[PDB]
Each structure stands twice: as C-alpha cells, then as structure tokens.
C-alpha cells in the first residue's frame, strides 16, 4: 500500500508563528504530490513534556484530524515520529475579528448572519458527540474565504486565574468551572454578538472581575446596532442563567437558517 502520512521532507519550516500550549508553532509550506504549495502552521510538542501532555497533544490532533467539517479548521497531517509535527492549514485572511474590523464599511448584515450560521453548524456537529469546545470567539475563528469561516482549536483549559476568557463565559463556567454543550451555547451567542458588532470585545467597558456581578443582576450585552432584532432575541435565550433553558445548537441552526433566508429575501426588496 502507498505511504499514508505526510513525509517530513514535504514540509519546510520558514519562521516562528508563536508559542502554543504544548510548544512552539512554526509557519511552513507543505508540498503535496501534485506539487502544489500549501501554507501550513506546524504545531510541536516539547520533547521534555510529561508523557501526559504528550498524550493530550496527540489527542487534540486526533480530534482535529477526524472532525473533517467545512466550518472547523483543517488538519493536513500528523508526523508522529519525534519531533512530532501537527500540520494545520494556514488561512491567509486570518482571524475573523480582525477581518470584520477592516471590512466593516463594506460588509452586509447577510454575511454576518451567514458566518454565525456556519459556526453554528460546526457546533451542532460537536454537540451531537457531546464534545465541548470552550473557545467560540472571533479571535478563534479563521477566514478561509469571504464565503467560509472555520472554528479554531479547542479551548486550552481541557488539557487541563489561567487568563480565562471571563467576558465570553457562562455563569456556571465562571462560578463552578462547569463546561457543557449548554455553556458552549452561551459562548456561541457571545461570538454572535462579536460578529454582529464587527469584532467588538464583549463587556469592553468592564474589568473581568465586574462581569459575574453584572450577569447576576440580569444585565446582558446590548443589541448591536445592525443586529436583526430576531437574532438579539436568540442571543438573549442563549444567555439564560439556567443552562437547561438555553436552546440546543440543533435548534439554533434551524433558527439561524430561517433568519438567513429571511434576510436574503428582505434584501431584494
Ligand atoms: Mg428559567
């Protein structure tokens, strides 16, 4: 049978991209069999790491390899042999938050609803296998093309004050470190708020320590200027203090699809 894995020689490291949880991340170029140049991010794991952290590094690779969803970031390959490389597709358009900020003056509300729906579909898939993501935010969404966004890597806290994203988190996550598909629904609605606000930071007017007090009073993020009122109602249902009262992602996909079709039609007239 033909060689399955990526050969290490087909991946050239060009520069440091940054420091990740398990080790350094490099920018590189992967050359496929057709000779095409594919820009990649190469995640590495420190050789000195505990075999537990080495296992978890591989576990995340295995999940990303198998998800294979149009709205989740693509894994290109795994080179298991040390030094272990996780080869991810690199997206030149970059993060969604910055993309929205630079394109604010040309972006239509239709497109913001589309991105929300695309991420919602990714989340419905994760919900179907009870897989909790914990980092659904515009800084962790990549723009594959103007037509397609992709949810990024799982939240680091699964691995396991840690600089938690307090301003995006459900009250049960903040208060009791509970992370469930329902706390993902809360976070997703914060992500929608970011999208429909062209990348504003949620609760930008508060310090992290102020956030839970505000939520307990029943205060919530305000309606973004260009947010369709129907979508704000959807967000408010996602921000129910009671996780059991929040919509499931399956329900949200139906709701968002309806809104998308409605906005497309309203737009013509
Ligand atoms: Mg209730």
From Swiss-Prot:
Binding site for ATP: 17-25, 43, 89-95
Superkingdom of origin: Eukaryota
Domain Protein kinase: 11-260
Residue numbers annotated as active site: 135 (proton acceptor)
Annotated tissue distribution: Most abundant in the brain, with highest levels in amygdala and hippocampus. Low levels in kidney (at protein level). Also expressed in spleen and lymphocytes.
Places the protein is found: Cytoplasm; Cytoplasm, Perinuclear region; Cell membrane; Cell junction, Focal adhesion
PTM description: Phosphorylated on tyrosine residues in response to various stimuli that elevate the intracellular calcium concentration; this activation is indirect and may be mediated by production of reactive oxygen species (ROS). Autophosphorylation occurs in trans, i.e. one subunit of the dimeric receptor phosphorylates tyrosine residues on the other subunit.
Subunit-level organization: Homodimer, or homooligomer. Interacts with SIRPA and SH2D3C. Interacts with ARHGAP10. Interacts with DLG4. Interacts with KCNA2. Interacts with NPHP1, ASAP1, ASAP2, ARHGAP26, SKAP2 and TGFB1I1. Forms a signaling complex with EPHA1, LCK and phosphatidylinositol 3-kinase; upon activation by EFNA1. Interacts with GRB2 (via SH2 domain). Interacts with P53/TP53 and MDM2. Interacts with MYLK. Interacts with BCAR1. Interacts with PDPK1. Interacts (hypophosphorylated) with PXN. Interacts with RB1CC1.
Connected disease: Aberrant PTK2B/PYK2 expression may play a role in cancer cell proliferation, migration and invasion, in tumor formation and metastasis. Elevated PTK2B/PYK2 expression is seen in gliomas, hepatocellular carcinoma, lung cancer and breast cancer.
Functional note: Non-receptor protein-tyrosine kinase that regulates reorganization of the actin cytoskeleton, cell polarization, cell migration, adhesion, spreading and bone remodeling. Plays a role in the regulation of the humoral immune response, and is required for normal levels of marginal B-cells in the spleen and normal migration of splenic B-cells. Required for normal macrophage polarization and migration towards sites of inflammation. Regulates cytoskeleton rearrangement and cell spreading in T-cells, and contributes to the regulation of T-cell responses.
Family stated for the protein in its record: Belongs to the protein kinase superfamily. Tyr protein kinase family. FAK subfamily.
Misc remark: Promotes bone resorption, and thus PTK2B/PYK2 inhibitors might be used to treat osteoporosis.
Name of the protein: Protein-tyrosine kinase 2-beta
Organism: Homo sapiens
Lineage: Eukaryota, Metazoa, Chordata, Craniata, Vertebrata
